[PDB]
Design a protein around this motif. Structure first.
Motif, PDB file in Angstrom:
ATOM      1  N   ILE A 164       0.828  -1.247  -0.004  1.00  0.00           N
ATOM      2  CA  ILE A 164       0.162  -0.002   0.023  1.00  0.00           C
ATOM      3  C   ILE A 164       0.764   0.982  -0.023  1.00  0.00           C
ATOM      4  O   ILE A 164       2.042   1.359   0.631  1.00  0.00           O
ATOM      5  N   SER A 165       0.241   2.355  -0.689  1.00  0.00           N
ATOM      6  CA  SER A 165       0.977   3.565  -0.662  1.00  0.00           C
ATOM      7  C   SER A 165       0.115   4.862  -0.599  1.00  0.00           C
ATOM      8  O   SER A 165      -1.061   4.590  -1.097  1.00  0.00           O
ATOM      9  N   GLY A 166       0.659   5.897  -0.466  1.00  0.00           N
ATOM     10  CA  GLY A 166      -0.184   7.174  -0.259  1.00  0.00           C
ATOM     11  C   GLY A 166      -1.075   7.346   0.842  1.00  0.00           C
ATOM     12  O   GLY A 166      -2.031   8.271   0.929  1.00  0.00           O
ATOM     13  N   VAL A 167      -0.645   6.435   1.781  1.00  0.00           N
ATOM     14  CA  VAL A 167      -1.379   6.273   3.271  1.00  0.00           C
ATOM     15  C   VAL A 167      -0.597   6.408   4.270  1.00  0.00           C
ATOM     16  O   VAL A 167       0.837   6.162   4.153  1.00  0.00           O
ATOM     17  N   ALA A 168      -1.141   7.340   5.309  1.00  0.00           N
ATOM     18  CA  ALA A 168      -0.126   7.640   6.631  1.00  0.00           C
ATOM     19  C   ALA A 168       0.153   6.410   7.283  1.00  0.00           C
ATOM     20  O   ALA A 168      -0.257   5.484   7.094  1.00  0.00           O
ATOM     21  N   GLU A 169       0.726   6.839   8.692  1.00  0.00           N
ATOM     22  CA  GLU A 169       0.990   5.593   9.415  1.00  0.00           C
ATOM     23  C   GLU A 169       0.113   4.657   9.979  1.00  0.00           C
ATOM     24  O   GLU A 169      -0.147   3.537   9.377  1.00  0.00           O
ATOM     25  N   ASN A 170      -0.701   5.214  10.659  1.00  0.00           N
ATOM     26  CA  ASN A 170      -1.751   4.572  11.379  1.00  0.00           C
ATOM     27  C   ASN A 170      -2.895   4.212  10.314  1.00  0.00           C
ATOM     28  O   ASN A 170      -3.622   3.090  10.977  1.00  0.00           O
ATOM     29  N   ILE A 171      -3.353   4.744   9.598  1.00  0.00           N
ATOM     30  CA  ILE A 171      -4.258   4.320   8.674  1.00  0.00           C
ATOM     31  C   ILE A 171      -3.901   3.146   7.872  1.00  0.00           C
ATOM     32  O   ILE A 171      -4.701   2.532   7.518  1.00  0.00           O
ATOM     33  N   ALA A 172      -2.504   3.295   7.552  1.00  0.00           N
ATOM     34  CA  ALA A 172      -1.992   1.935   6.897  1.00  0.00           C
ATOM     35  C   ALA A 172      -1.810   0.822   7.756  1.00  0.00           C
ATOM     36  O   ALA A 172      -1.892  -0.385   7.369  1.00  0.00           O
ATOM     37  N   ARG A 173      -1.641   1.052   9.214  1.00  0.00           N
ATOM     38  CA  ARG A 173      -1.655  -0.047  10.093  1.00  0.00           C
ATOM     39  C   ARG A 173      -3.028  -0.585  10.410  1.00  0.00           C
ATOM     40  O   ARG A 173      -2.836  -1.733  10.551  1.00  0.00           O
ATOM     41  N   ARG A 174      -3.929   0.326  10.247  1.00  0.00           N
ATOM     42  CA  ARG A 174      -5.248  -0.459  10.668  1.00  0.00           C
ATOM     43  C   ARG A 174      -5.711  -0.908   9.027  1.00  0.00           C
ATOM     44  O   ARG A 174      -6.493  -1.923   8.863  1.00  0.00           O
ATOM     45  N   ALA A 175      -5.174  -0.538   8.158  1.00  0.00           N
ATOM     46  CA  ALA A 175      -5.763  -0.820   6.803  1.00  0.00           C
ATOM     47  C   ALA A 175      -5.210  -2.203   6.187  1.00  0.00           C
ATOM     48  O   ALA A 175      -5.770  -3.236   6.013  1.00  0.00           O
ATOM     49  N   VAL A 176      -3.830  -2.421   6.534  1.00  0.00           N
ATOM     50  CA  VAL A 176      -3.182  -3.641   6.559  1.00  0.00           C
ATOM     51  C   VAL A 176      -3.400  -4.655   7.667  1.00  0.00           C
ATOM     52  O   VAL A 176      -3.478  -5.804   7.327  1.00  0.00           O
ATOM     53  N   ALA A 177      -3.610  -4.018   8.904  1.00  0.00           N
ATOM     54  CA  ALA A 177      -3.919  -4.955   9.836  1.00  0.00           C
ATOM     55  C   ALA A 177      -5.422  -5.647  10.121  1.00  0.00           C
ATOM     56  O   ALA A 177      -5.324  -6.740  10.482  1.00  0.00           O
ATOM     57  N   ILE A 178      -6.206  -4.584   9.615  1.00  0.00           N
ATOM     58  CA  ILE A 178      -7.494  -5.328   9.547  1.00  0.00           C
ATOM     59  C   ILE A 178      -7.768  -6.185   8.256  1.00  0.00           C
ATOM     60  O   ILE A 178      -8.390  -7.475   8.544  1.00  0.00           O
ATOM     61  N   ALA A 179      -7.159  -6.079   7.227  1.00  0.00           N
ATOM     62  CA  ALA A 179      -7.377  -6.985   6.289  1.00  0.00           C
ATOM     63  C   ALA A 179      -6.443  -8.235   6.428  1.00  0.00           C
ATOM     64  O   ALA A 179      -6.524  -9.144   5.515  1.00  0.00           O
ATOM     65  N   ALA A 180      -5.440  -8.335   7.479  1.00  0.00           N
ATOM     66  CA  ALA A 180      -4.939  -9.480   7.754  1.00  0.00           C
ATOM     67  C   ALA A 180      -5.833 -10.617   8.571  1.00  0.00           C
ATOM     68  O   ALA A 180      -5.374 -11.625   8.944  1.00  0.00           O
ATOM     69  N   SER A 181      -7.174 -10.014   8.754  1.00  0.00           N
ATOM     70  CA  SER A 181      -7.945 -10.943   9.556  1.00  0.00           C
ATOM     71  C   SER A 181      -8.845 -11.728   8.611  1.00  0.00           C
ATOM     72  O   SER A 181      -9.553 -12.533   8.808  1.00  0.00           O
ATOM     73  N   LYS A 182      -8.530 -11.627   7.150  1.00  0.00           N
ATOM     74  CA  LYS A 182      -9.184 -12.109   6.310  1.00  0.00           C
ATOM     75  C   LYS A 182      -8.357 -13.256   5.592  1.00  0.00           C
ATOM     76  O   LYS A 182      -8.512 -13.636   4.398  1.00  0.00           O
ATOM     77  N   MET A 183      -7.512 -13.882   6.578  1.00  0.00           N
ATOM     78  CA  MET A 183      -6.448 -14.590   5.879  1.00  0.00           C
ATOM     79  C   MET A 183      -6.117 -15.891   6.915  1.00  0.00           C
ATOM     80  O   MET A 183      -6.061 -15.634   8.143  1.00  0.00           O
ATOM     81  N   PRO A 184      -5.769 -16.940   6.471  1.00  0.00           N
ATOM     82  CA  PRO A 184      -5.679 -18.335   7.057  1.00  0.00           C
ATOM     83  C   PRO A 184      -4.324 -18.146   7.879  1.00  0.00           C
ATOM     84  O   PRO A 184      -3.987 -19.311   8.389  1.00  0.00           O
ATOM     85  N   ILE A 185      -3.338 -17.372   7.643  1.00  0.00           N
ATOM     86  CA  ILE A 185      -2.010 -17.465   8.097  1.00  0.00           C
ATOM     87  C   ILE A 185      -1.596 -16.374   8.488  1.00  0.00           C
ATOM     88  O   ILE A 185      -1.725 -14.892   8.441  1.00  0.00           O
ATOM     89  N   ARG A 186      -0.632 -16.238   9.628  1.00  0.00           N
ATOM     90  CA  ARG A 186      -0.286 -15.148  10.674  1.00  0.00           C
ATOM     91  C   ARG A 186       0.817 -14.268   9.615  1.00  0.00           C
ATOM     92  O   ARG A 186       1.572 -14.798   9.090  1.00  0.00           O
ATOM     93  N   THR A 187       0.447 -13.189   9.719  1.00  0.00           N
ATOM     94  CA  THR A 187       1.314 -11.934   8.888  1.00  0.00           C
ATOM     95  C   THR A 187       1.895 -10.736   9.970  1.00  0.00           C
ATOM     96  O   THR A 187       1.726 -10.884  11.110  1.00  0.00           O
ATOM     97  N   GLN A 188       2.447  -9.950   9.274  1.00  0.00           N
ATOM     98  CA  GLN A 188       2.808  -8.759   9.848  1.00  0.00           C
ATOM     99  C   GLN A 188       2.849  -7.508   8.705  1.00  0.00           C
ATOM    100  O   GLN A 188       2.974  -8.062   7.711  1.00  0.00           O
ATOM    101  N   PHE A 189       3.003  -6.119   9.116  1.00  0.00           N
ATOM    102  CA  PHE A 189       3.051  -5.156   8.221  1.00  0.00           C
ATOM    103  C   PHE A 189       4.444  -4.776   8.362  1.00  0.00           C
ATOM    104  O   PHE A 189       5.132  -4.804   9.198  1.00  0.00           O
ATOM    105  N   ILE A 190       5.013  -4.325   7.272  1.00  0.00           N
ATOM    106  CA  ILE A 190       6.446  -4.082   7.098  1.00  0.00           C
ATOM    107  C   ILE A 190       6.714  -2.826   6.176  1.00  0.00           C
ATOM    108  O   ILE A 190       5.989  -2.680   5.455  1.00  0.00           O
TER     109      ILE A 190
END
Lengths: 134, 100, 46
Positions: free
Chosen positions: A105-131
RNA sequence: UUCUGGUGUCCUAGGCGUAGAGGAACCACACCAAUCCAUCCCGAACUUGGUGGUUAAACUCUACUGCGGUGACGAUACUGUAGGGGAGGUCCUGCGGAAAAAUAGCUCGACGCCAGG
RNA sequence: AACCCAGAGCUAGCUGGUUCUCCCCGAAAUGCGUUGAGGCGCAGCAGUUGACUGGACAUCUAGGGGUAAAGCACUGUUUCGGUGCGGGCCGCGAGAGCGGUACCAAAUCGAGGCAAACUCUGAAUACUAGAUAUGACCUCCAAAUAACAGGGGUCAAGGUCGGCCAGUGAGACGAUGGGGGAUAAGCUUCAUCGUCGAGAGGGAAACAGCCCGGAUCACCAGCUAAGGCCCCUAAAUGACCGCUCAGUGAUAAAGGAGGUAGGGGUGCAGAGACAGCCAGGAGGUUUGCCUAGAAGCAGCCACCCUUGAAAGAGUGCGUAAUAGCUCACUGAUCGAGCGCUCUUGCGCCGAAGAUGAACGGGGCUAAGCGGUCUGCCGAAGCUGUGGGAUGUAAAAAAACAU
RNA sequence: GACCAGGCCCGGGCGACUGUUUACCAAAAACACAGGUCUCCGCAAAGUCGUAAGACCAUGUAUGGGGGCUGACGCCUGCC
RNA sequence: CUAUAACGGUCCUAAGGUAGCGAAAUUCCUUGUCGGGUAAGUUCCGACCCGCACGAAAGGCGUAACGAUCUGGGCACUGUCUCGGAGAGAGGCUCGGUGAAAUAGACAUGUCUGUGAAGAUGCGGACUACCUGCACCUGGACAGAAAGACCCUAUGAAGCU
RNA sequence: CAGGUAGACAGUUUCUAUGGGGCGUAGGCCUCCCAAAAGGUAACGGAGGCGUGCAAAGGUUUCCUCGGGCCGGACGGAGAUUGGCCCUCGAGUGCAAAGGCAGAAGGGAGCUUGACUGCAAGACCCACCCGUCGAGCAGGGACGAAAGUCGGCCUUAGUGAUCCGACGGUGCCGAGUGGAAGGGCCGUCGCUCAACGGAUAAAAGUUACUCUAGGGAUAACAGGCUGAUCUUCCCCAAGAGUUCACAUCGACGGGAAGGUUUGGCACCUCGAUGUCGGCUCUUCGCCACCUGGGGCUGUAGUAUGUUCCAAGGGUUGGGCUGUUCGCCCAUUAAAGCGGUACGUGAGCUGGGUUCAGAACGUCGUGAGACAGUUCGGUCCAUAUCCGGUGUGGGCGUUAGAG
């Protein structure tokens, strides 16, 4: 989602291996969703995560879907089990091994991308993180 | 309702590897097409198999970007023999047929 | 669910006693210093 | 005894390109005609017989790493044995072997025969 | 399609059964073929008798590969950016020159990914062969005692080709490599290996296949492997570092968490750092649109500057709207650590079944979990002392292997 | 006044009906039936049992004797 | 107006179902929809016809009488029932006589829980049980029978077409 | 004697792998993958072809390079034929794929018949049968000037053993002898013997009237493993709810538990584990319908919605159906869901593994058949042991008793 042309209709499975040293880097975008866990991710979870972070950004910026399935999974019907007749137009599957970037993701600030990438990691069968793009 | 089970069972491959003693008429390579081109002291077959013409070793060397060249050399090597277990075997055959 | 129970001989590769302490694998038997050989067990006396 | 030019063989295969040189001799193009020969048409190709000038094309030599080919070391994946963890997918240890890709480099081939001057 | 007798002791690739002892050896559940699939013929693998042989096991070297890994150079497939062959519509009225275009698409470049039926590459192993190398024991020996080496003797072991002659051809689980499945099954089919089959004993509470281990026999012998040392039940209520407070100690995840023991970063302080109380939090201003009102608090657009110690077109509540309560920020008193992220170790919740502790038991805050140090228990293993038999072997004795 | 000694009605399906049927799990809607129709048979008949002689048919003669299907009775029984 | 098809054309057959019947002994969907009966009716009766897959002597549609026929409803009647209760006999219980049988490896024959050829008195841990009769009950002993009539195999047997 | 001709009658056949079936599919040959870098290797695993074709598409000599983009040329355009450059093997090879093949094994031209005879050292493959390659020799040739090459095709598929019969031919046998009939030998022909190692030259169904030898090697009922399906719960939150994700639902997705449905495997049982419903009679789980306590509520109160603790107790009577389930009536605090092999037929009775008779529809030529319908249709039993409920007798309780 689904490849248009298939060189071969049905294709058998294949087992996960170690850390993918190629697809681990960040090409486009500032933030990413790195996977620590080797499994399959269908195109259905990719639609779920894509709608999740596109509608969680919702004002600006652009996401980057890295992976494409490129292999089918044939589910046999309930017809008393002996043959692998037809299961090819059923759900497609992407192989993911550890290290591999799934979303960016690009064009997004810090915590809006933390909730954007982190909320969309709940739609997924495998544990992840944001980098971050280091 | 399957459209399968059409196996073939056919076999090919390298019969005599490199640095091995060949025979006159010994089939060195059974191959499909030409993975191994005929060098010297060999012959190509009716179905492109490579047989040896004379006695001696076989070798492999390039002559292009990929090619392999099965060849046969006359092999006048190795007269000396320090083997000593075999003389103990035959000598114990003698001692057992003289002891009893 | 979808978690298989571990049946017989899969129960034995899991629940057998395994001494997974790297110290207690290193142990060899104790060594005492060697002794002179003991004398004869008996002797003819005439 | 170097060049010249027919000939090969090993080859890391040595090529493209940018530059400079060679017509004493040699090799090669070019002009004239066609008797053997010839092109499903053309002497373009091939053949015969001559004027015989040039390096223009083509060959040969010397440089360059701009492409091309080749290609490390160290690492690391993997793997053979001996084991361990996990519910599974699968991962981690001791010893042995050891990549590929990329990169630093290497490469504008190397050895022989015979006939001139 | 009667009953009796006879062929007839019909036939049965099927079922059951097949009786004394001792010693040596010892499988297979695989392939091919089958009117065949629970049968059979051959091969593979036994027993015995030979004939040729000189190998097995370790180490090294050489050959072909295209698997794992890897990679995009071919075949496909795919994400994004740019130039984008070409189209979309406004349009030109009539024998069209070429105009209008932030929009979709062949081709290439760059950044990227994937593939059993893709390979520029390419292992480790495995296969074929070549090469190096005495496997234990007894004895003599260099004037000789050690030792090196040598002389002699004994034993053990590989393979090919046969003769006679069998079984077996339903396998099972465990590790790795895969296919079918739903990478579900103690599932099914293969490839290498280990065990069971055909394997006793010890550990696993019990329990074919998991670990140690290969049972000739005796001993009221000793040392050990796996595994254990509170009691049931043999041996440490052993020592020294840390951890856990859930009886976790048998258990299952996503996810949550000021749990506790650390470890790495980054930001503030003796010019007072955190937490609480108190003071200020204002002017244009009700920024401009809407609404009766929208005064920060239904919302749309940006989302100012000034006094300053600081104040945000506001963090939330509230009001018809106001007014107002309050906070981010700063001022003041005491005073010395405070944040916010990753991360492991062991924990908590998530975590619920039908007869009754049901997880060896009792129980234990160690008698639990990690890191070392010394000893002991622990098999039918080994050793020791004595018998028996087999093979050398052809008489006895003795020896070595079994 | 003991023993003895009809329960009935309203509908529907099938079989017209009385009978026969699986001795020892089925009594029925099954079989039969009167009636209908097709078809064969002129007597040294057809048909049936028997290699044959022959016998039943029948000491009967198409208003009779076999055989097939349907099942009283009422309306009919279509097309190929 | 929504329909539905009197009517029409086309393809293929030898002909494309006539009267009557019709969720039927025939209807899968289906407990079709409506009406009756019932407080409530997958059963019954009367209709519609969308007849999976009626139909004219393998006869079709009807009906009086008949049926140890099937099925729906109603009156009277009652232990069928609510919800059992009492009494009389023949057994059962005891005594005296006579006296078997199926079955049976030996039985010193607990419960839970776990394991095991995946349902254990027999193996493991715990708990509980003095020995041994009599009268009842049958949950287990995968209880007794009887080389599973169902399923499959046999290069089996037999009947029938 | 000969032709025809009735299952009237007789003897027989009616395959197998499988899903252990109607309804399918396949059986033999070749190429790639699976196949784990020698070779091999299975599954009703993933993809395709073959049952030939060529008088040249065989042989030899010789020559030549394709294929694609761009540019030029009023027919002719995007694309025919021609010229030029670029990339250099991407084209092609009678057809499927693989491996090959660039001065070629690809295209053309000349001459041609080796698409011969008699053979053959040695190899590969190897159960056998088979199958594949081959240096080299003699005869007689084809091409080329020669060198040399040629025993069909670039290769791998295009096939079939044997018995018998047939044609052509031969210095062979000719049942006393000479012949002949007939038979050999050689060269070839005749099988979709395609179920392709081929049973015979020649063979279909049904059995619910059945019967026998077997099997848990193999189904049904039940148990066990699995948990796709089902029940229950949980993570995220785009929304709906006048504002407001989380009073209440929660889309797109994700993670679990249970073994109560339908499934998958075929692990115990077929020398017998008796299915579905009802009656009687238990007992147990909580995933709670009510009763008891509480939180939150878009809870003013009554009544709620949801949720936490809690399984002590209760969970109605009926019309339909064999019914489980379900619909409806009258209610009730509520009329819970399941385990215990239908929980329970050695305690008891109806529909059914629809047994033997019959009928309707449909299928079949027919016998007969339907996971279609209807009528009728024997269900045994004295408890040995454990278990239970009652009730004793003995002995013990350290003298004996009430």
């Amino acid at each position: 989602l689904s490849p248009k042309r298939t060189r071969f209709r049905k294709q058998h499975r294949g087992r996960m291996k170690g850390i993918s040293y190629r697809g681990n880097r960040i090409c486009f975008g500032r933030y990413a969703l790195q996977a620590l866990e080797p499994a399959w991710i269908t195109s259905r979870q990719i639609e779920a995560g894509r709608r999740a972070m596109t509608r969680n950004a919702r004002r600006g910026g652009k996401i980057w879907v890295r992976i494409f399935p490129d292999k089918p999974v044939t589910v046999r019907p309930a017809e008393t089990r002996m043959g692998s007749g037809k299961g090819s137009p059923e759900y497609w599957v992407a192989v993911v091994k550890p290290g591999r970037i799934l979303y960016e993701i690009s064009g997004v600030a810090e915590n809006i991308a933390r909730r954007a990438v982190a909320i969309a990691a709940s739609k997924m069968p495998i544990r992840t993180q944001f980098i971050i793009s280091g | 309702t399957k459209n399968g089970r059409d196996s073939k069972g056919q076999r090919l491959g390298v019969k005599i590897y490199g640095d091995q003693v060949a025979k006159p008429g010994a089939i060195i390579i059974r191959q499909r097409g030409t993975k191994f081109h005929p060098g010297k002291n060999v012959g190509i077959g009716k179905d492109h198999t490579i047989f040896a013409l004379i006695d001696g070793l076989v070798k492999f060397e390039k002559y292009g970007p990929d090619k392999k060249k099965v060849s046969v050399y006359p092999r006048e090597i190795q007269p000396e023999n320090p083997n000593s277990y075999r003389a103990r075997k035959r000598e114990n055959f003698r001692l057992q047929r003289e002891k009893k | 669910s979808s978690r298989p129970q571990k049946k017989g001989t899969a129960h034995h590769m899991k629940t057998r006693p395994k001494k997974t302490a790297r110290w207690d694998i290193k142990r060899g038997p104790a060594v005492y210093p060697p002794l002179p050989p003991l004398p004869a067990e008996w002797t003819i006396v005439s």
